[PDB]
Every structure is written in structure tokens, then in C-alpha cells.
């Protein structure tokens, strides 16, 4: 299948309570493999997956150095952003960054990403061409001008096409037992009466990986999109994910409803019914 590597930075200011906190996590697909927290007793990039632990001291020294440099740069960016938005130094604010690469089955670059936000809103983003920028407002346009003048996009492009893809390929090989294994959902339908003339049918999906899944209800073969209650996909805590979808049906019509499940770990889509 295709695969992705993503790094996520969060920098959060807290006036009166020290310097901004910087946290960074790294993922391959839906598997976290490293973390960094500036509030830790002794901040270091640290392993969160067994297949990364084999990297040597030069690796961990390198990544730790990067995260301290990044913490410093985004602390300064919080101070800069304050001025760009004419804001007081009393409040707490947040910068977020997500970046990385996607590769196809053959391991070549599908596309790269480098996107930033301020207080939960888009700030600036590297365009898919990896050579121009999209700025969300006149503040981000000031940053865009600086980055254009310094040819920043060229350096990100070189990273995204080169080191990002090369490292992702290495991780996929070292973690092939798990990163390259899809676990299909375990599925069942439950039935619970609401009243004498209505019942809830809930379609469960359990123990699947990766997180991407489609659960749909049909009535007489017609999708019940606007009438289905769909809960957010949630982590089980053991690498896998869980989801359910529910529909309220008239008593006696339960067999007119079917649940359809799509997942990477399934050769063909599943169709389930309530089995009384």
C-alpha cells in the first residue's frame, strides 16, 4: 500500500509560567515512533516503537539536537506572531506544524507536506509543487515574503524529496512486521429496542489497523448517510482502532438494513446483518 511519515510540533506560550512548552511527535502511518517534550526532566528525542530502538547514538544525538534547535526557533516565532497580530503579552498562544512525505507501493514520492497554524487556524502552507506558498492572512504574507527572499521552499523540497523519503523507506523495512501488516476489522451487529416500535442497530468494527475504515448502513440497498450516527474512530491502546455506526429502525424491519465495511485488510468489502 502507500505509506506516510509525519512529524507534528506544538509550541505553547504560558506567560508568568516559564518559556513556551515544545512537544514533538513522529508517526509512520498510524504508528507513533518518537517523542520530544521540553518539559521532561531531561529532554531527549526518545523511542516510542520497538523498530526505532536499534538506531545508534549518532541518530538520537542528531534528532535531540534538532528538537532543541526547533524548540528555540518556534519560541521566537511565538514572540514574532504576537507582534504580527497586535496581541498582548498576557495571553497564551499556540503554533502547530505538521510536515512529511507520502510514498507509493514502489517507494517513490507521491507528495510532500509542510503546513503551519497559529491558535488553531491555518497560517502558512507549502504548496504541492514544493516551490510556492499559501498564506492565510496578511500576517502570514509577511512570513511568505521572507521565505521567498531566502529561497526556503527549495530547501524543504530537497528535504522532502531526499532525506524524508529515504528515512521513511528505511523505517518501513526495519518495521516491516508491523508497519507493512494490515489487521482487518472484527465485526458484529447488536440490537437494542428503544421502544415497542423502534430499535437501534449498531455495527461494530474492532481491532483494525490502519485507522482508515468505512462503515455504512443501507436500507433496502440505499445509503442512510443523513440518518446514521457515526462515532469518531478511537484507539484501543494496543496499536489497533475501534469504530461503530448506528441506525434507529422500525420494529420488524431489521432485516431490511445491512452494514457495509471497507478496510485495507479486507480483500472484499463486508456486508453484515443483525442475526437474531
Amino acid at each position: 500500500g502507500s505509506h506516510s511519515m509525519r512529524y507534528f510540533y506544538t509550541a505553547m506560550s504560558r506567560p508568568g509560567r516559564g518559556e513556551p512548552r515544545f512537544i514533538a511527535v513522529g508517526y509512520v502511518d498510524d504508528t507513533q515512533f518518537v517523542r520530544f517534550d521540553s518539559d521532561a526532566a531531561s529532554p531527549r528525542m526518545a523511542p516510542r516503537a520497538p523498530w526505532i530502538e536499534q538506531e545508534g547514538p549518532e541518530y538520537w544525538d542528531g534528532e535531540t539536537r534538532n528538537m532543541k534547535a526547533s524548540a528555540q526557533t518556534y519560541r521566537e516565532n511565538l514572540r514574532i506572531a504576537l507582534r504580527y497580530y497586535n496581541q498582548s503579552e498576557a495571553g497564551s498562544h499556540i503554533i502547530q506544524v505538521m510536515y512529511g512525505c507520502d510514498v507509493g507501493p514502489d517507494g517513490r514520492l507521491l507528495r510532500g507536506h509542510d503546513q503551519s497554524a497559529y491558535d488553531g487556524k491555518d497560517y502558512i502552507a507549502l504548496n504541492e509543487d514544493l516551490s510556492s506558498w499559501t498564506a492565510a492572512d496578511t500576517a502570514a504574507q509577511i512570513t511568505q515574503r521572507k521565505w521567498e527572499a531566502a529561497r526556503v521552499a527549495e530547501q524543504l523540497r530537497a528535504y522532502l524529496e531526499g532525506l524524508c523519503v529515504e528515512w521513511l523507506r528505511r523505517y518501513l523495512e526495519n518495521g516491516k512486521e508491523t508497519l507493512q501488516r494490515a489487521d482487518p476489522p472484527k465485526t458484529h451487529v447488536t440490537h437494542h429496542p428503544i421502544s415497542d416500535h423502534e430499535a437501534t442497530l449498531r455495527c461494530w468494527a474492532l481491532g483494525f489497523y490502519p485507522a482508515e475504515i468505512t462503515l455504512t448502513w443501507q436500507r433496502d440497498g440505499e445509503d442512510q448517510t443523513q440518518d446514521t450516527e457515526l462515532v469518531e474512530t478511537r484507539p484501543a491502546g494496543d496499536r489497533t482502532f475501534q469504530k461503530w455506526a448506528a441506525v434507529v429502525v422500525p420494529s420488524g424491519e431489521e432485516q431490511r438494513y445491512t452494514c457495509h465495511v471497507q478496510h485495507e485488510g479486507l480483500p472484499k468489502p463486508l456486508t453484515l446483518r443483525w442475526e437474531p
Binding site: G62, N66, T73, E76, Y99, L163
Partner: peptide, 12 residues
């Protein structure tokens, strides 16, 4: 490195 190294160029 695996993370992007030259982060100083990303001054706002």
C-alpha cells in the same frame, strides 16, 4: 537527520 535539520530558516 530524519527530522528537518535547518530549522533556523523558518523564522517567521
Amino acid at each position: 537527520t530524519s527530522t528537518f535539520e535547518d530549522v533556523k530558516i523558518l523564522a517567521f
